[PDB]
Amino acid sequence: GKGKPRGLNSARKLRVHRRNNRWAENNYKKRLLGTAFKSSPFGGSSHAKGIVLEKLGIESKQPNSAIRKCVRVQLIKNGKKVTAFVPNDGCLNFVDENDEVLLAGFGRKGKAKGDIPGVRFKVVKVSGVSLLALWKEKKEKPRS
Amino acid sequence: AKVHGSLARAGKVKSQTPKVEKTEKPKKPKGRAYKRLLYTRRFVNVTLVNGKRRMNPGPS
Amino acid sequence: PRAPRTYSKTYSTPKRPYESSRLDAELKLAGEFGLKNKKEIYRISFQLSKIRRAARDLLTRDEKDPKRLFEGNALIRRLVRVGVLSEDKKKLDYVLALKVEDFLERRLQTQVYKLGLAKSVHHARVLITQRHIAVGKQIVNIPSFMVRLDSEKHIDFAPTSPFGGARPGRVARRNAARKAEASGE
Amino acid sequence: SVGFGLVYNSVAEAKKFEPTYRLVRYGLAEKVEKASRQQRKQKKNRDKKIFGTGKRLAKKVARRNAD
RNA sequence: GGAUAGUGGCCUACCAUGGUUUCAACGGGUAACGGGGAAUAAGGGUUCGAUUCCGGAGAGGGAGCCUGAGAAACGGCUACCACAUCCAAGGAAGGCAGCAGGCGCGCAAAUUACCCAAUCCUAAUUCAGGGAGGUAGUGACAAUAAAUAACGAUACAGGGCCCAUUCGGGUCUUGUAAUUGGAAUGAGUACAAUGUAAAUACCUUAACGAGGAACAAUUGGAGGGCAAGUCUGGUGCCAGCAGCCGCGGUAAUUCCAGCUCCAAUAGCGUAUAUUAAAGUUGUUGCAGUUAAAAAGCUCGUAGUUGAACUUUGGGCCCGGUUGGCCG
RNA sequence: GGACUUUUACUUUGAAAAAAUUAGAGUGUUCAAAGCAGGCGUAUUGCUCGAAUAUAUUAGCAUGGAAUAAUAGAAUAGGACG
Ligand SMILES: [Mg+2]
Ligand SMILES: [Mg+2]
Ligand SMILES: [Mg+2]
Ligand SMILES: [Mg+2]
Ligand SMILES: [Mg+2]
Ligand SMILES: [Mg+2]
Ligand SMILES: [Mg+2]
Ligand SMILES: [Mg+2]
Ligand SMILES: [Mg+2]
Ligand SMILES: [Mg+2]
Ligand SMILES: [Mg+2]
Ligand SMILES: [Mg+2]
Ligand SMILES: [Mg+2]
Ligand SMILES: [Mg+2]
Ligand SMILES: [Mg+2]
Ligand SMILES: [Mg+2]
Ligand SMILES: [Mg+2]
Ligand SMILES: [Mg+2]
Ligand SMILES: [Mg+2]
Ligand SMILES: [Mg+2]
Ligand SMILES: [Mg+2]
Ligand SMILES: [Mg+2]
Ligand SMILES: [Mg+2]
Ligand SMILES: [Mg+2]
Ligand SMILES: [Mg+2]
Ligand SMILES: [Mg+2]
Ligand SMILES: [Mg+2]
Ligand SMILES: [Mg+2]
Ligand SMILES: [Mg+2]
Ligand SMILES: [Mg+2]
Ligand SMILES: [Mg+2]
Ligand SMILES: [Mg+2]
Ligand SMILES: [Mg+2]
Ligand SMILES: [Mg+2]
Ligand SMILES: [Mg+2]
């Protein structure tokens, strides 16, 4: 029969066996260990707001040649320092330093995205004003 | 690898593309009428069958 | 501390987002019966989908089963009443079949046009939402009304508005006000 | 217009069995206005700090004008 | 025996050595209140439930207690701990996990408004009270219905079609049209009545209220997966794109735009989680010679599993429910 | 009423079973999501249909079955009936 007990009373063994083998599932393992709460910069939450320390020049991976504009951010609720990407064109002109920014995931479930090495987050808002909006003409960046 | 690269060129191309203004155009109908406008365009009279069909043809 | 107000959504959405055949097939249906939404198709497919499910499940039961006979006949008699289901095929192996257009064909949107009164599916729309026509002396502004087929004979223009005759109305009476004022004293 | 109505066997009968806001609507009863609902509450709570009739407490606080 | 309203190691005295455990005790974790239920639709499943009902627990943290039918009560008291307010420095006083409201916390959440008219509750009680509850305000949480246009005429153009020796446009409409035409309606505005506890909106409905300067729909995308350009301009492995594959180093089908086009549309994108796709957790239903994977070998307890055989066969009776040929 | 009875599993039917939610009948909220309304007249002194049904699975209770799979019996006869 190849392995699994086919008996009518063997329910225990069949349960316990699945229980054991779930741990080989990456998603199941993370969920129970509480990896989100323990590791990872966000508290497990969807976004986290933080503060800009310096503006990085991160150079793209191969076979790409570029300089990807990014910022080192210190999450408020944490202290955890994190480097995040500032999307589209310019927009690194919108940020500067000691500014408040809203970080979001990159979509890849951890796992930095493109040719950009080691960057797992991206900037959504600065000074409460939403990079997108700034980028077209729609809004303007506040006083101080 | 390298982390501090130059930030000077940020925004380069967007800042140097020559601006051309949006040109004023007939206002397209919103709602059912647009669906209608599509229907009669896509199906009823059609346009050109050349080789199969074409939706947004250029200088063909 | 109140009983929850219950609710349900009336539509479903296709899994394959871009299917050129389904899209074409969709647009035509809209362009015919005069619908502004893909949702107005999505809704019908969802209603049809639950009906076929009920029908499907009933069929697996033994013939002349008490639940099957009772509920089956009800489904049939409901469907027949509104005019989707043909009188000839009453036994619900055809409700299992049916199809979308059979439902669409019964909308007050369409019945008002099929009967004349409009001479466009789109003219039909605008008339209905504009507080014209009626079933009883009761006015109906919803294009999705689903004429009950025994109310089919009573579709006509309203006691109010022009076209059923009331009074020409502000846009016409405006011109009549500009005719007697400019030409006369 | 679909609606509801009652007809009492006399006008004395109506006045006793009718909601007092209706007799107002009709004019069969005057609306006697009072302080704000939260004004009355505050009055009660102020009143609660006084044990007795309190006009005796007006004289003892008049003695304060001396000391 | 004592204690309790009362059973009981609940407590005490005397006596004894018992009680649970691989069928997992004991211990640890839980970003754990339990349940009715929620999400996901072949089925089997998987994940979720602080939260409209039910049960439990708590009232800053502990303990203790008075009152009473009922509390180990906190909009009751007493003490300690932690907070913390007023003062004339002697002292006194507070407990929003009630309603609003403020700070803090953060990705994350509304008015210091009105009323007991309803729903019901309490009291000495038809009356009083009720931030229970209702009302409105804030409110793209989720859910439903569905405006942003409808109809002609005319100007060439066409496909129809009867004829074609050959001009062709003629009446059946396909509509692209940079002059036209009168029709229609609510979005709003607003007498009035309706509504309401009093108001507000809705439903009604006088007077007003549509021609592009509008009462002007958006949000993403247009190389592939994936529906829609190899158009023009710009940049030149830069700036940027890009879930993934991949684009950009001078004619870029991926960047920055203009034009045009697609999809969904009062909504559409993104991030995080979960579910389906997943027969990549496999009871249904996986795989293990070489792709990840049979313990060096045999014994062996727990566990799972375990050959065949013991009233079958024949006879009689009673009365049901469908379906036929007939009515 | 007396005197006694080898133990189980499985299956059947049924009782006991909150509502809201789910599935679902009826009813034209103008449609619909809903709600549990409503529908008829002599519309001047009333007539009237409703507010169904299904699911509710382990355990416990009650009942029918006796295949399948266990358990016990009589061998130092300390057996069985009277
Ligand atoms: Mg391993
Ligand atoms: Mg690569
Ligand atoms: Mg650094
Ligand atoms: Mg913290
Ligand atoms: Mg009061
Ligand atoms: Mg008093
Ligand atoms: Mg011992
Ligand atoms: Mg264990
Ligand atoms: Mg907890
Ligand atoms: Mg709960
Ligand atoms: Mg739970
Ligand atoms: Mg919590
Ligand atoms: Mg402690
Ligand atoms: Mg206490
Ligand atoms: Mg309090
Ligand atoms: Mg209390
Ligand atoms: Mg002093
Ligand atoms: Mg509060
Ligand atoms: Mg919110
Ligand atoms: Mg209140
Ligand atoms: Mg608009
Ligand atoms: Mg206009
Ligand atoms: Mg666009
Ligand atoms: Mg394509
Ligand atoms: Mg180019
Ligand atoms: Mg482009
Ligand atoms: Mg979508
Ligand atoms: Mg099975
Ligand atoms: Mg495999
Ligand atoms: Mg190898
Ligand atoms: Mg190997
Ligand atoms: Mg081996
Ligand atoms: Mg071993
Ligand atoms: Mg056997
Ligand atoms: Mg049962």
Mind giving me the DSSP string for chain C?
--PPPP--------SSS--HHHHHHHHHHHHHHT-S-SHHHHHHHHHHHHHHHHHHHHHHSPTT-HHHHHHHHHHHHHHHHHTSS-SS--SSTTTTT--HHHHHTTSHHHHHHHTSSSSSHHHHHHHHHTT--BSSSS----TT----SSSGGG-B--SSSTTS-S---HHHHHHHHHHHHHS--
C141 in contact with nucleic chain E (CB within 7 A): yes
Q: From CA B42, how far away is CA A60, in angstroms rounded?
A: 45
Q: What percent helix, strand, coil does chain B show, rounded to 5?
A: 30, 0, 70
Non-local CB neighbours of C121 within 8 Å, separated by 6+ positions: C32, C33, C34, C109, C110, C113
| Tokens at A136, concatenated | 């077209």
Chain A closest-CA separation from residue B49 CA (Å): 40
Q: Which residues in window 21-50 of B are less than 7 A from strand E by Cβ?
A: 21-25, 27, 29-34, 36-38, 40-42, 44-45
Q: Where does residue A3 fall: left (phi above 0), alpha (psi -120 to 50 degrees), or beta otherwise?
A: left
Q: In chain C, which residue's Cα lies nearest the Cα of B35?
A: C36
A128 in contact with nucleic chain E (CB within 7 A): no
Q: Which residue has the tokens 């199969």?
A: B52
Chain F footprint positions (protein CB, under 7 Å): 20-26, 28, 30-35, 52-54
Spatial distance from the CA of D19 to the C1' of E117 (Å): 9
Task: Measure B1 CA to ligand 35 centroid, in angstroms.
Answer: 71
Decide if C122 and B32 are in contact by the 8 Å CB cutoff: yes
Task: Measure A32 CA to ligand 10 centroid, in angstroms.
Answer: 22
DSSP D27: T
State which residues form the domain around A61.
1-144
Amino acid identity, position A30: K
Q: Where does residue C181 fall: left (phi above 0), alpha (psi -120 to 50 degrees), or beta otherwise?
A: alpha
Q: From CA C29, how far away is CA C101, in angstroms rounded?
A: 8
Q: Is A71 exposed, middle or buried (0-12, 13-18, 19+ CB in 10 A)?
A: buried
Q: How far is CA C42 from the centre of its chain?
A: 14
Yes or no: say if C133 and C142 are a contact pair by the CB < 8 Å rule: no
**Domain tally, chain A:** 1
Task: Measure C37 CA to ligand 27 centroid, in angstroms.
Answer: 15
Decide if C31 and B32 are in contact by the 8 Å CB cutoff: no
Please check whether residue C132 touches B, CB under 8 A.
no
Q: What are phi and psi of C89, to 5 degrees?
A: -100, 95
Yes or no: say if A86 and A95 are a contact pair by the CB < 8 Å rule: yes
For chain A, report the end-to-end CA distance as a whole number of angstroms: 73
Task: Report which of C171, C170, C164, C115 is spatially closest to residue C137, judged by C-alpha positions.
Answer: C164
What separation in angstroms does the CA of B14 have from each of A64, A66, A124, C146, D53?
A: 21, 16, 20, 55, 83
Task: Report which of C146, C144, C143 is spatially closest to residue C132, judged by C-alpha positions.
Answer: C143
Considering only CB atoms, B42 lies closest to which of C27, C34, C122, namely C27
User: Which residues face A122 on adjacent strands?
Assistant: A85, A104
Task: Report which of A20, A45, A40, A17 is spatially closest to residue A30, judged by C-alpha positions.
Answer: A40
What count of CB pairs under 8 Å joins B to C? 28
Report the interhelical angle of C121-129 vs B32-39 (nearest 10°): 180
The nucleotide minimizing the C1' distance to residue C47's CA is: F32
Task: Report which of C85, C82, C157 is spatially closest to residue C115, judged by C-alpha positions.
Answer: C157
Q: Does residue D44 sit in helix, strand or coil?
A: helix
Q: From CA B39, how far away is CA D8, in angstroms rounded?
A: 66
Yes or no: say if C58 and C22 are a contact pair by the CB < 8 Å rule: no
Task: Report which of A144, A134, A142, A124 is spatially closest to residue A50, judged by C-alpha positions.
Answer: A124
Task: Measure C2 CA to ligand 15 centroid, in angstroms.
Answer: 24
Q: Residues D25, D31, D33, D37: is their CA dihedral positive or negative?
A: negative
Decide if A59 and B7 are in contact by the 8 Å CB cutoff: no
Yes or no: say if A118 and B1 are a contact pair by the CB < 8 Å rule: no
Chain B closest-CA separation from residue C36 CA (Å): 4
| Tokens at C22, concatenated | 């389904």
Q: Which residue has the tokens 């007006």?
A: D58
Spatial distance from the CA of A100 to the C1' of E30 (Å): 35
Per-residue HEC secondary structure of chain A comes to: CCCCCCCCCCHHHHHHHHHHHHCCCHHHHHHHHCHHHHCCCCCCCCEEEEEEEEEECCECCCCCCCECCEEEEEECCCCCEEEEECCCCCCCCCCCCCCEEEEEECCCCCCCCCCCCCCCEEEEEECCCCHHHHHCCCCCCCCC
User: Which residues face A71 on adjacent strands?
Assistant: A55, A84
B51 in contact with nucleic chain E (CB within 7 A): no
Q: From CA A14, how far away is CA C108, in angstroms rounded?
A: 59
Task: Measure A22 CA to ligand 10 centroid, in angstroms.
Answer: 28
Question: Per the omega criterion (within 30 degrees of 0), is the bond before B29 cis?
Answer: no
Decide if B39 and C31 are in contact by the 8 Å CB cutoff: yes
Q: From CA C108, how far away is CA C148, in angstroms rounded?
A: 9
Non-local CB neighbours of A116 within 8 Å, separated by 6+ positions: A58, A60, A61, A68, A70, A85
How are beta strands A100-105 and A70-75 bridged, if at all?
Answer: unpaired
Yes or no: say if A106 and A119 are a contact pair by the CB < 8 Å rule: yes
What separation in angstroms does the CA of C3 have from each of C6, C8, C9?
A: 9, 16, 19
